[PDB]
Symmetry: D2
Subunit: 32 residues, 4 copies
Amino acid sequence: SYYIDADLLREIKQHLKQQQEGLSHLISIIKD
Amino acid sequence: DLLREIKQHLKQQQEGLSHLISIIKDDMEDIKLV
Amino acid sequence: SYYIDADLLREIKQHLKQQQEGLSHLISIIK
Amino acid sequence: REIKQHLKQQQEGLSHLISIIKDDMEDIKLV
C-alpha cells in the first residue's frame, strides 16, 4: 500500500484547532 | 434574516471542521512503523 | 519512519477543499 | 467586516494547510 510521513497529521491538527478557535470567536462576536 | 444566515453558515463550517478533526484523531491511532 | 495510509491524506485534502468553498461563500455573502 | 477579513485570515490558513499537504503527497512511499 501507499504511505506518507505521519508527522503531517500533527501539523494539520494543530492548525485546525486554531482555525476552530477562530470560528468560535467569530460566531461569539455576532452573538454579542 | 441577514445575521441569522451568516451565523447559520458559520455553525455549519464549525461542524465540518469538527468532523475533520475527529477524522484526524481517528487516523492518529493507525500509524505504521516501517 | 512512521507513516499513515496515503489515502487518509487524500480524504483530509478533500475536506479542506470543502471548508475552503464554504469559507469563500460567507465572504461572498457579504459582497 | 473585520469578520469578512477575519474569514480571509482563515481561508489563507487552509491554503497553507493545503499547500503543505500537496508537497508531502509528492513524497509517497510504496510498500
